[PDB]
Amino acid sequence: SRKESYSVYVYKVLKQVHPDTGISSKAMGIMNSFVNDIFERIAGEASRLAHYNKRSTITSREIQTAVRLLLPGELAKHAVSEGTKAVTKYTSS
Template sequence: MKVKQGDKGKKKPVKEPSPIESESEEAVEDHDVYKVDEAGLKKPKTEKATTFSSYISKVKKQVHPDMRLSKSTVKIMDSFIEDFFTRLCTESSNLMMSVGNKSLRAEDVLRAITLILPGEIGSHAVSEASKAISAYEMDKESRKSA
């Protein structure tokens, strides 16, 4: 490490990149980070990946409190849920546009559920969703009256 002479005679350490570091991409990225910090700018925030692992564990504890899930199982369940939500959103959006609505309604989501999920599991999901919608509307009305 070399020492650089400052304006008022104080010695400041200067970091010199080694020949190996100067050729690598990491050194270039680190060099850019120093420039951002020196300029007083903030680093761009990276988006956090949305995971459903906490919800998966809560539901699992309700159903089977003694069982455990491995990390790979949770990752598989997480990708399954993400895929299902993507399909549901796409189908709901297509139904909304085909009807000519400009906003998504609960009925569109219920129809999308029936189209995506087959048989008994679809009817069970629709009944649970209808229960949740009616509970939400009752809570909304009770808050208005209070």
């Protein structure tokens, strides 16, 4: 059939961060499963946060609280900063 993945985006991020570092197929499969794992965790936690307050809509606030819950301190701080910058950049356009 036609299976969906993330490898091209991993290439783009890798070439933004490193010019001359290759990558095997096994590492690509590991990073693909890694992205699916974190996305599954955050989506499930956001769903329970939306369900707890009798709300019926996922917004950016629930994902911000979920990322503040799951990730440890420094990663949570940097991730909230990055996401806030991205939301402002999208909104001003």
